[PDB]
Design a protein around this ligand. Structure first.
Ligand SMILES: CCCOc1ccc(C(=O)NS(=O)(=O)c2ccccc2)cc1CNC(=O)c1ccc(-c2ncccn2)cc1
Ligand SMILES: CCCOc1ccc(C(=O)NS(=O)(=O)c2ccccc2)cc1CNC(=O)c1ccc(-c2ncccn2)cc1
Lengths: 256, 264
């Protein structure tokens, strides 16, 4: 029966590679120094950064915020495509699929964002750039505390030393969460997640035999992700409440 | 197997201490709730006059109606902190930790445990109180004057889902131990020795659920995911309390609970 769990793990790994360009293994090689990325450590390297690498992604703090928004919008489509490759997912009630993606994408965004972070900064622009933790923290209120909680999570998350093959299954487990509000048919969702869970459990045991209770430790990080997401939502609200300089083009805002 | 043997020993030790620290077990609570018996029948409180006669029939160990009920839950919570603290000390390695970290684990751990153990005392219709002598309906509690009317409801919602896991006391003893030894608590000085203990606890829990619920696929994984639900409930609860102290300036909060809420 473990032959089907290994097949599922492989299936998911291949799909994850196809859907997500910048893998963790690639990002790690770049971060550690093993064709260096442009570094943004202050206002002037910022200015030159957009001059050089030029991101589709007026005020500096606002321009950075909006850039992260553009990337998350792309990430949602990459995630959506990955979800469709998870066995059983497309066979679910279409409203439920929509629901699972709607509530799942932020958790996955921050999970995968950790792959792009170390304690010193984050890879941006498909790894063409590196923007420092301190520079981000130096953005005026309340933008200077937007990325920081994510860095704190990443550092803890990255200590688990997961690889791409591990994360492919973990991500799929997040998507198939039966507790999302408004779901109409919870049974096949938890039935699929139960199977992904077994796959992840086995994967972690074979891949990290020396890492005791890694499975448990990973599931515990769910708490952390969700806390990060609700916290993020709340900051977004303050940006909405205050901040008049956030208004984009009518059509542009529709996209977000 | 010699590994497995040490894990079973740890499970037995924990279940034993749990029975010793917590006077009203889930097993007892379920016996009262399912109302099979004639000696263990609770007096039911479902409205005001019912509550009034409750005060007579029920010996409570410890003004306005919502307030007397609030102060009632506050007393019980404090009693629970004491019970949990006593249980915590029995967990191997706990008392050997940095004193400041022992306190930190308790501070952030006790509410998650209170609402875990509170689920043992609930069904969809209400909650056992005063050592199972009383039963207060969910509707009566929901009908309370705002904002007291919605203090208890999120706990009920959690409990019915949690209860569907069908855990028994021997399972819960270990799960509660795992909650206490949480290495991700804010302000922990020495994370590693906590994590090492928690690691051992997680092994014990995992084996326990497999032996006790062999037909329950991924119960271990499902139980751990409930820790997310617990965090949420505690967060909501604390926010609710901050609302109260501003609206109800004549309402007193117990100092121990206050110290727990402080910078939570
Ligand atoms: C692979 C998953 C997606 O990557 C994500 C996803 C979400 C987020 C995110 O939620 N950001 S955020 O919390 O909304 C934020 C707000 C204000 C300042 C910093 C961050 C960020 C990135 C990472 N950020 C970037 O890639 C990025 C950052 C800055 C720019 C940028 N900087 C200067 C000018 C224009 N763009 C472009 C991209
Ligand atoms: C280990 C089990 C823990 O039990 C707990 C723990 C926490 C809480 C809790 O946090 N409650 S609460 O959310 O603060 C709340 C306050 C007011 C109305 C509804 C809810 C409640 C109970 C349950 N409540 C009671 O046991 C209780 C309820 C009512 C009375 C009471 N009622 C009327 C008059 C006097 N006492 C006494 C105890």
């Amino acid at each position: 029966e473990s032959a089907d769990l290994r097949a599922l793990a492989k299936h998911l790994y291949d799909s994850y590679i196809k859907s997500f360009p910048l893998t963790k293994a690639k990002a790690r090689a770049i971060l550690t120094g093993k064709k260096s990325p442009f570094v943004i450590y202050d206002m002037n390297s910022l200015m030159m950064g957009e001059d050089k690498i030029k991101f589709k992604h007026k005020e500096v703090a606002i321009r950075i915020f909006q850039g992260c928004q553009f990337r998350s919008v792309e990430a949602v489509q990459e995630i959506t495509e990955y979800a469709k490759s998870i066995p059983g997912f497309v066979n679910l009630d279409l409203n439920d699929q929509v629901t699972l993606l709607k509530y799942g994408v932020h958790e996955i965004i921050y999970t995968m964002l950790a792959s792009l972070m170390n304690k010193d900064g984050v890879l941006i622009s498909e790894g063409q750039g590196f923007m420092t933790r301190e520079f981000l923290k130096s953005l005026r209120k309340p933008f200077g505390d937007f990325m920081e909680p994510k860095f704190e999570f990443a550092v803890k998350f990255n200590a688990l030393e997961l690889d791409d093959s591990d994360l492919a299954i973990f991500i799929a487990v997040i998507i198939l969460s039966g507790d999302r509000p408004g779901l109409l048919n919870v049974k096949p969702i938890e039935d699929i997640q139960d199977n992904l869970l077994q796959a992840l459990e086995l994967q972690l045991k074979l891949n990290h035999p020396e890492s005791s209770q890694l499975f448990a430790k990973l599931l515990q990080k769910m708490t952390d992700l969700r806390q990060i997401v609700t916290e993020h939502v709340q900051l977004l609200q303050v940006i909405k409440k205050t901040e008049t300089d956030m208004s984009l083009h009518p059509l542009l805002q529709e996209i977000y």
